[PDB]
């Protein structure tokens, strides 16, 4: 069973969102700023959703997205140089990953595994390091321009879903 047409609001303490279809997930505007030292977020079985997290409520840790199709993924990762974003079994997703960092040559590593036809926004090219760990020692991803719709979650919903 999946849940349809629900807006999920990320709050501190939440760590998992699963079995979503034509849903949205966004960061809460309330209790903002307060963060835990370490955390982890996991998304699993996501279809035709908009994930738009402009605020993460842990300083260090990871975001995992697994089994995700035809979705929009906007993430604003913490400044933590070692922050992890691991993407597995993504198909036909548009991705905007930015890092909230005052660092000069700020880079966000993105680990991908078994992804296909993923589009990373071209604006993020110089800031991401994509490492394909599918079969560790081409059409997995590409960098293209697309309208980010002012990062308005429902506009993205209407534009791409």
Alpha carbon dihedral 47, 109, 58, 49, in 10-degree steps, equals -10
Max CA pair span of the chain: 45
Contact 51, 73 (CB under 8 A): yes
How far, in Å, CA of 5 to CA of 12, rounded? 22
Structure method: X-ray
- What pairing do the DSSP bridges indicate for beta strands 7-10 and 24-27? parallel
How far, in Å, CA of 148 to CA of 94, rounded? 10
Q: What spatial distance separates the first Cα and last Cα of the chain, rounded to whole Å?
A: 20
And the tokens for 16?
């998992």
Domain that holds residue 63: 1-161
Tell me how many domains the chain contains: 1
Question: Three-state SS string across the chain, please?
Answer: CCEECCEEEECCCCCEEEEEECCEEEECCCCCCCCEEEEEEEEEEEECCEEEECCCCEEEEEEEEEEEECCEEEEEECCCCCCEEEEEEEECCEEEEEECCCCCCCCEEEEEECCECEEEEHHHHHHEEEEECCCCCCCCEEEECCCCHHHCHHHHHHHHC
Structure's resolution in angstroms: 2.0
Contact 43, 67 (CB under 8 A): no
Q: Count CB-CB contacts under 10 A for residue 144.
A: 10
Q: Which residues contact 28 (CB under 8 A, 6 or more apart)?
A: 9, 10, 11, 55
């Amino acid at each position: 069973t999946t849940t349809l047409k629900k807006h999920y609001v990320l709050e501190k303490g939440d760590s998992a969102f699963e079995n979503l279809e034509f849903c949205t997930v966004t960061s809460t505007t309330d209790y903002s700023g307060n963060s835990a030292l370490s955390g982890s977020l996991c998304f699993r079985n996501i279809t035709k959703c908009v994930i738009n997290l402009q605020r993460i409520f842990f300083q260090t840790g990871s975001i995992f997205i697994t089994d995700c199709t035809d979705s929009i993924i906007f993430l604003r990762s913490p400044s933590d140089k070692d922050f992890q974003i691991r993407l597995r079994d993504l198909k036909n997703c548009k991705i905007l990953i930015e890092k909230l960092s005052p660092s000069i040559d700020c880079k966000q590593v993105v680990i991908i595994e078994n992804c296909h036809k993923c589009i990373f926004n071209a604006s993020t090219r110089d800031h991401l390091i994509i490492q394909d760990f599918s079969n560790p020692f081409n059409s997995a991803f590409a960098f293209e321009d697309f309208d980010i719709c002012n990062k308005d979650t429902m506009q993205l919903f209407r534009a791409y879903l």
